Design a protein around this ligand. Structure first.
Ligand SMILES: CNC(=O)c1ccccc1Oc1nc(Nc2cc(OC)c(OC)c(OC)c2)ncc1Br
Ligand SMILES: CNC(=O)c1ccccc1Oc1nc(Nc2cc(OC)c(OC)c(OC)c2)ncc1Br
Lengths: 259, 264
């Protein structure tokens, strides 16, 4: 007994994991059975009691079509549930990969970052900010160097909006988070290299007031670190977006294009 | 769509009965097909145009469904064709507040209190659901008549710019962490500008461009609007507390909902 979702099918045995509102299964196309997919089941009533904008996630995933961004193939709406048929990444999340390997060579990090950067180029050209990049949201797919990286979870994402009645905080806050992803990529690279994030805290509100009071300094870069990787981390991990490396510097950064 | 008539679920409309357009939607006066005395607004939204925009119709629909109040424009139905999406909404036979002000110039404090009582009732609902409109303005405030000024009923519309307040994210950018709730009081400013325009006949703060008004506010830690000398103490207190550049210093919702001006 397989459950059918449009031209795809899955077994309830083949559970991958959960979201807050979604269950995810390993599935396949019904004719092209070698084609593996992830199928997210999302209860419509639970979702309508949340602040989740699935419409937005779907709109953004459709707009993106890139080998380093998790593919959405299909959306099926039943009266109870919504089903997302997506690319299956057979390597899990980067979080679990780091748990397994500890730290990564600069060679490995360059490979991962080249791919992340390729994804970011697409995001940037469409004016989309992810805002929630983290190892749990970076998925891994193996071929048979062999690892391909895929950005996932556009739940927190937003479009850059590139008025006498509008609140001054709103006018003035345009583009405030335009460089957010560059910080995130920084923290992720940092963790890859060093083996913990640059900035930990006991709670969400503890990290808020840390950043709010600039009780936040450049973190410890190991003395092993190559000049280019160190330059990159320093320019990404700037508390003020005013002072943070911008996208064009990042895409074309020396660290990304060598031996 | 050669023909003059279109069917939209249980509703229908004639293309002759055009009300107007926004950026993405064309809006018609329609009716229920059986209960033909029931007038509705039918918004037609081209799906290809919409897919080239940053408009989140899914969000607008989710928010309209969640809201159910006499001072918030009602959503009755959503129909999807391969070309178009149709919203069947409450028809407001009075147009927008912008056109009402164009017609009347300025409004008595009595009139403003009636309008503001209703707007405030809508805000109470938004606030209790943790929704910020962010785009309140006379063009987005619609008017509905029975058969008169107390005869007028107000309906907030256009949740296009609206958003939900999200009540160790080690990986998250500090600007994002720190910017939570930054715009929590935005609608209070907006309602201030709208009241101000109702009273005086212009917005409190005009400029040469959008970026000129940004740098005016940016480099003026507290600005004071010109309150006409005739203005009652309560209305003046209200405007001054709403029109604070810094959300830190701006009247909060509980002061606003229970403000002396609203019960007098
Ligand atoms: C943010 N990541 C998700 O969307 C996601 C989260 C939980 C479960 C599945 C998820 O979606 C997805 N998950 C995969 N591959 C995958 C595969 C795993 O094991 C081999 C795995 O380890 C349990 C894993 O951890 C989450 C993910 N691929 C595509 C999507 Br689309
Ligand atoms: C917030 N404005 C809109 O969504 C809107 C804009 C253009 C056309 C219709 C619009 O939606 C709506 N418009 C009405 N009633 C209405 C009626 C008008 O004349 C009698 C009118 O003047 C042309 C008007 O335009 C400002 C609105 N009701 C519900 C919706 Br839902």
């Amino acid at each position: 007994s397989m459950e059918v979702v449009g031209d795809f099918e899955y077994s309830k045995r083949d559970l991958v994991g959960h979201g807050a509102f979604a269950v995810v299964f390993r599935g396949r196309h019904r004719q092209k059975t070698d084609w593996e997919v992830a199928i997210k089941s999302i209860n419509k009533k639970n979702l309508s009691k949340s602040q989740i904008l699935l419409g937005k996630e779907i709109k953004i995933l459709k707009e993106l079509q890139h080998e380093n961004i998790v593919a959405l193939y299909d959306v099926q709406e039943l009266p109870n549930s919504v089903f997302l048929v997506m690319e299956y990444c057979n390597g899990g999340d980067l979080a679990d990969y780091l748990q397994a390997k500890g730290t990564l060579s600069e060679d490995t990090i360059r490979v991962f970052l080249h791919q992340i950067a390729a994804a970011m180029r697409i995001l940037h050209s469409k004016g989309i900010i992810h805002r929630d990049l983290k190892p749990q949201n970076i998925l891994l797919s193996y071929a048979n160097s062999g690892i391909r990286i895929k950005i996932a979870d556009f739940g927190f994402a937003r479009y850059l909006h590139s008025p006498m009645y509008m609140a001054p905080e709103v006018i003035m806050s345009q583009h405030y988070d335009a460089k957010a992803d560059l910080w995130s990529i920084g923290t992720v690279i940092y963790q890859c290299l060093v083996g913990k994030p640059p900035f930990q805290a006991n709670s969400p509100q503890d990290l808020r007031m840390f950043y709010e009071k600039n009780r936040s300094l450049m973190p410890s870069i190991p003395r092993e670190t190559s000049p280019y990787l160190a330059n990159l981390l320093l320019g990404l991990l700037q508390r003020n977006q005013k002072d943070r490396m911008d996208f064009e510097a990042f895409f074309s950064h020396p660290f990304l294009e060598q031996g």
